Scaffold this motif. Sequence first.
Motif, mmCIF file in Angstrom:
data_model
loop_
_atom_site.group_PDB
_atom_site.id
_atom_site.type_symbol
_atom_site.label_atom_id
_atom_site.label_comp_id
_atom_site.label_asym_id
_atom_site.label_seq_id
_atom_site.Cartn_x
_atom_site.Cartn_y
_atom_site.Cartn_z
ATOM 1 N N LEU A 167 0.830 -1.196 0.000
ATOM 2 C CA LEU A 167 0.000 0.000 0.000
ATOM 3 C C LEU A 167 0.868 1.251 0.000
ATOM 4 N N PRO A 188 -5.106 6.006 1.395
ATOM 5 C CA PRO A 188 -5.722 6.352 0.108
ATOM 6 C C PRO A 188 -7.174 6.777 0.260
ATOM 7 N N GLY A 189 -7.600 7.674 -0.627
ATOM 8 C CA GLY A 189 -8.954 8.186 -0.608
ATOM 9 C C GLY A 189 -9.194 9.307 0.374
ATOM 10 N N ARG A 226 -12.619 17.974 -5.986
ATOM 11 C CA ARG A 226 -12.288 16.586 -5.695
ATOM 12 C C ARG A 226 -11.649 15.944 -6.919
ATOM 13 N N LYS A 282 -10.261 12.461 -8.791
ATOM 14 C CA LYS A 282 -10.860 11.133 -8.862
ATOM 15 C C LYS A 282 -10.292 10.183 -7.815
ATOM 16 N N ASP A 283 -9.109 10.471 -7.273
ATOM 17 C CA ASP A 283 -8.512 9.630 -6.243
ATOM 18 C C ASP A 283 -9.005 9.968 -4.840
ATOM 19 N N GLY A 284 -9.873 10.970 -4.691
ATOM 20 C CA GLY A 284 -10.488 11.280 -3.419
ATOM 21 C C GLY A 284 -9.852 12.423 -2.655
ATOM 22 N N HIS A 308 -15.183 3.716 1.994
ATOM 23 C CA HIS A 308 -14.721 4.021 0.650
ATOM 24 C C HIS A 308 -13.608 3.059 0.265
ATOM 25 N N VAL A 324 -10.520 2.082 -2.984
ATOM 26 C CA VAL A 324 -9.688 2.536 -4.089
ATOM 27 C C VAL A 324 -9.458 1.353 -5.015
ATOM 28 N N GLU A 354 -6.063 5.154 -10.584
ATOM 29 C CA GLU A 354 -6.785 4.854 -9.357
ATOM 30 C C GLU A 354 -7.988 5.775 -9.199
ATOM 31 N N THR A 355 -9.064 5.232 -8.634
ATOM 32 C CA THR A 355 -10.260 6.001 -8.332
ATOM 33 C C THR A 355 -10.757 5.620 -6.946
ATOM 34 N N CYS A 356 -11.220 6.616 -6.198
ATOM 35 C CA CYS A 356 -11.786 6.414 -4.872
ATOM 36 C C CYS A 356 -13.300 6.542 -4.958
ATOM 37 N N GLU A 357 -14.010 5.529 -4.467
ATOM 38 C CA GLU A 357 -15.460 5.472 -4.570
ATOM 39 C C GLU A 357 -16.067 5.077 -3.232
ATOM 40 N N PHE A 371 -7.882 -1.184 -2.184
ATOM 41 C CA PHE A 371 -7.807 -0.798 -0.782
ATOM 42 C C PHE A 371 -9.216 -0.587 -0.254
#
Lengths: 62, 131, 386
Positions: free
Chosen positions: A2, A16-17, B80, B82-84, C54, C56, C70-73, C361
Amino acid sequence: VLKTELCRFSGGKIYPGRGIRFIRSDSQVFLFLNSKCKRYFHNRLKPSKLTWTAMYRKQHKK
Amino acid sequence: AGNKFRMSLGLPVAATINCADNTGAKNLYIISVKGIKGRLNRLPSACVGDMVMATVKKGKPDLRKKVMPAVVVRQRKPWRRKDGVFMYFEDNAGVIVNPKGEMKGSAITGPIGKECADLWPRIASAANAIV
Amino acid sequence: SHRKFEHPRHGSLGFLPRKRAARHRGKVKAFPKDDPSKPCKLTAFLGYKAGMTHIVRDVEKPGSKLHKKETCEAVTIIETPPMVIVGVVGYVKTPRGLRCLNTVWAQHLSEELKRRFYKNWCKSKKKAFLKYSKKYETDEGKKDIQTQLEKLKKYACVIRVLAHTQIRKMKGLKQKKAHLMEIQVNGGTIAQKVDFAYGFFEKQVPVDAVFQKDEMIDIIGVTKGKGYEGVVTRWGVTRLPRKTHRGLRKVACIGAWHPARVSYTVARAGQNGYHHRTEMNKKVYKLGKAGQESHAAITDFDRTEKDITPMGGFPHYGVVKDDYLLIKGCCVGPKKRVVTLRQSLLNQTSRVALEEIKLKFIDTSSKFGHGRFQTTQEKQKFYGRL
RNA sequence: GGCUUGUGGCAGCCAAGCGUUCAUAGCGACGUUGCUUUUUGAUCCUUCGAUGUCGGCUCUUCCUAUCAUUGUGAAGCAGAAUUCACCAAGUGUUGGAUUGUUCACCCACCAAUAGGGAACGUGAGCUGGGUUUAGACCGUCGUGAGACAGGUUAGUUUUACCCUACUGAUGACAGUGUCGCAAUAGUAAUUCAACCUAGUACGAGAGGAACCGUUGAUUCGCACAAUUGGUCAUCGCGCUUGGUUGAAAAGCCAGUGGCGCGAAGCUACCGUGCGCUGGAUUAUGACUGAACGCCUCUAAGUCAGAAUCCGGGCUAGAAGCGA
RNA sequence: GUCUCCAAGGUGAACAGCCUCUGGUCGAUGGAACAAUGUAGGCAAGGGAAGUCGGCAAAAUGGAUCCGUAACUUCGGGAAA
Ligand SMILES: [K+]
Ligand SMILES: [K+]
Ligand SMILES: [K+]
Ligand SMILES: [K+]
Ligand SMILES: [K+]
Ligand SMILES: [K+]
Ligand SMILES: [K+]
Ligand SMILES: [K+]
Ligand SMILES: [K+]
Ligand SMILES: [K+]
Ligand SMILES: [K+]
Ligand SMILES: [K+]
Ligand SMILES: [K+]
Ligand SMILES: [K+]
Ligand SMILES: [K+]
Ligand SMILES: [Mg+2]
Ligand SMILES: [Mg+2]
Ligand SMILES: [Mg+2]
Ligand SMILES: [Mg+2]
Ligand SMILES: [Mg+2]
Ligand SMILES: [Mg+2]
Ligand SMILES: [Mg+2]
Ligand SMILES: [Mg+2]
Ligand SMILES: [Mg+2]
């Protein structure tokens, strides 16, 4: 493995995020763990004078 | 690649932003935003990478009292990725361009957002640091 | 005279009346069309909203700016313990529509299911289904049950099973009264449907027997209740000027002189929230099976040994220990609300529906604050207590 | 508001002419037949023991004489653009400067910035800038008091708890409970950009598309709070002014003393997720086929066919109903 | 609405505001909840009058000390520019 970033105020771990990125006028990139660190940074509080920050603990050999 | 994703708008009409180009203008006063269909009472708003119509309020006399296109390169309103991660700049800035998107000046004083650089090759080529 | 300027009307007239739903459990209004060339299979399921986190992931979408990025949802965790099948219901096709023909129940019913038939279970004598159960003890009773099943096979056109949740397994819920629903059986002949239903009597049906990873599904439930609400928040009308005598949070003109009546199309203050809703195209990102190594939030990229439940537990819900579904986006209702899961009624052929998502993740930090640690052990090591 | 339609607005008929030739691609002089009541007039039927008198703001609905969007026929339609006409009111029709303005005129965006009704919609919904009381100034008029389809400045906007309508909420619906069916009513999705097609078709050049496919976006709708942002009397923690409890410590008072951070809950296109497909057809283009030995989309019969209608889906569930 | 006499301590320029002592007093019908709409009082990311007839309302400024202060002027002021 990670991939992780570090907060430039508290030296904390950012997963992340998450995270807040601030770009200063001189192209310096500042990344903050949360709103507390960002607000303290923009209030011009030095991390080395706040007991809970990593910089303070390193300076005081904690 | 694909197309730009939506980002938070933080520069409605009448917003005054710094001019980051070499033309001689000091600030840009936004009068409208390109591509806005709009809604009743809703002020058109622009973001980084948007093309707007603006006038120069402070600068050389040759640049004042006229309408020219401009592209926003920096904004203070967080948006924001896209990676948050939410990110923002220290100030609001833009550069004067022709309708085709070519920079009127030759250099950019500060950093510019990645979205604007991806959208406008000339601005990216004239830029120093992206993001 | 015509309105000076044009703007679209506030709110939709297709969700009228904006009243409190006549139910608490989401009702399946239309089941997927039945194809008899496929094996018998259930079409719906019952779950419980645990919380949100959330994720990734690396996006595989050629032509998109997110390709190989990468995208965070945000995602919603729904706990779906296996359901227990306790009966079969058959309907007959008639000129007036489907008519219920007969219901056959299993010999043994759990106390949780029987609680659904009482308002005060503890105070009662608990006589429900006691005489019905005895039909399985006498030879003539079993013969009569088999005859009823044969009649269902002969005359029914659609077959639905009766299934109830094992609600006491989720101690975070303070409910012992299980939820019961009818789930339609699709595929095979009517006799095959009846045999499939009967063979499952007093047996568990796991969630993965209905849904699977990457499938698009629909979520049915009741929205969060907000009580009495004014027009500005209930319908989205704009505020009146600051200097408006007698308040500014109103519709200024609620109608013209003629017709001399207020119409149903004008925004009015009333109940807001607690409305029945059906949301479409909610992709399943992962299917956690208890004690199968898929229940944990460990991914290929992130090998940290951790569970799906975030630090300190799911706020207002508890600890997820049974099977669960991780769905992209948000779902109806507050935490702990029972939600109905429905198989898609549409043909999913779009690129988004066919996409194979690979989680990279899964965040498990505390959601009761600005959580900075993923595990309690990590926090203890950070603070020098481990 | 009612009659009327001179006037205003919107259409048709004939064909002298215009249109490199050619009345009718596109127009239509001299004449002539109509329609409409978003113009203004004409009248005085209703209202003077009173129907609140401009405009704007908000909100809903309705019309078509269609600005844009869907599908088509025609061209003085090579392409591009444009123009004429046909089904068509499903969806949309914007941000600003001056003016009280309706109206007007410019700036800007846009697919477009079409025209209108609903007691010239809407004041116990607001506002009160203008008109239209009493104060006051100017100009012209009058001997004067004063006048003024001239200008200017200041000038109280009352009442709903009744009936209905509408929005939601109990109850009734012949023991009680669970699971269901279902008439009927409502309804929702909309438009644009970029890449490829392609510098291709077409065109001497100049210039210059489109289908399919892919990726996004606008307006709108329904939810939701993992992240970011907002919110403080968590009166949660810390700091701090003045007073006060002999002092320290610890509190209290200044209706939230003030400041910084602030979890939870609520909440934003200021955040995130989702928003659907079978049939029947309009215009139009056609099949076979007479009438009328040929011809003919029509007379019998038949096909394709749309932002259309219906169904489905979604919302509600009836002195309707089942197990 | 109706004339007048007496007038403590602290902060502070101050019978300003705020707190306290003597004296007076808790008299404003009470209880539960915390919907819409209101009345009174706040905050609000980015923009900053684009709102509106009109910046209406609100916000911003504010004490004291030091530096410094333009046009114009009836020479006095303007000026706390
Ligand atoms: K526009
Ligand atoms: K109107
Ligand atoms: K408003
Ligand atoms: K006429
Ligand atoms: K009259
Ligand atoms: K009268
Ligand atoms: K206006
Ligand atoms: K006055
Ligand atoms: K019964
Ligand atoms: K329907
Ligand atoms: K939350
Ligand atoms: K919060
Ligand atoms: K023929
Ligand atoms: K203004
Ligand atoms: K004005
Ligand atoms: Mg407006
Ligand atoms: Mg209109
Ligand atoms: Mg939280
Ligand atoms: Mg000709
Ligand atoms: Mg028409
Ligand atoms: Mg319309
Ligand atoms: Mg005179
Ligand atoms: Mg209907
Ligand atoms: Mg003193």
